[PDB]
Amino acid sequence: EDSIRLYLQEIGRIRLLRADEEIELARKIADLLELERVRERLSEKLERDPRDSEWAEAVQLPLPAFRYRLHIGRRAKD
DNA sequence: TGCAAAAAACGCATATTCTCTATGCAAAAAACGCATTAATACGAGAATTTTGTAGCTACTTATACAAAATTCAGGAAAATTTTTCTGTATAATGGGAGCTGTCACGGATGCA
């Protein structure tokens, strides 16, 4: 009869996964920083964002391939 | 304790006489008339004269334009206070607080 308990009760078991993945995340920490940071630097030069996936990265990036950078880089910071 | 009865008083004979009711005297008030003088008012004269009426004149104001010399309402800076946002780096690893003595009712489920 409790959502606080819920928090327990499903995350009391959640751990910290140590601080090793910090760098594994670091790779992504950036990478995301990038992926956006570009993509809005590119908002910001023009089109206020063409809503284009490739522009989601200043460097080239095959759609699915870069789709793996995000989502993976995201679960990293998730 | 009945009166018969005597002397002096107390009652039928007038002087006295003395408050007393009664008219003429007289003296000064008063008020009436002779009346005299003065004053209260009528007659005339022309003098002031204020009020009543006209026109001129000076003051006072009816009015028509408006920016006087001053008031105010925003507009846009500061000025300082205050508000919202962002940031500060050891480790820290499952939450307390009453419900347990109410009676009775009406469904609504579970549990063989």
From Swiss-Prot:
Protein localization: Cytoplasm
Chain's role: Sigma factors are initiation factors that promote the attachment of RNA polymerase to specific initiation sites and are then released. This sigma factor is the primary sigma factor during exponential growth.
Highest taxon, organism lineage: Bacteria
Similarity section: Belongs to the sigma-70 factor family. RpoD/SigA subfamily.
Protein name per the record: RNA polymerase sigma factor SigA
Subunit structure: Interacts transiently with the RNA polymerase catalytic core.
UniProt source species: Nostoc sp. (strain PCC 7120 / SAG 25.82 / UTEX 2576)
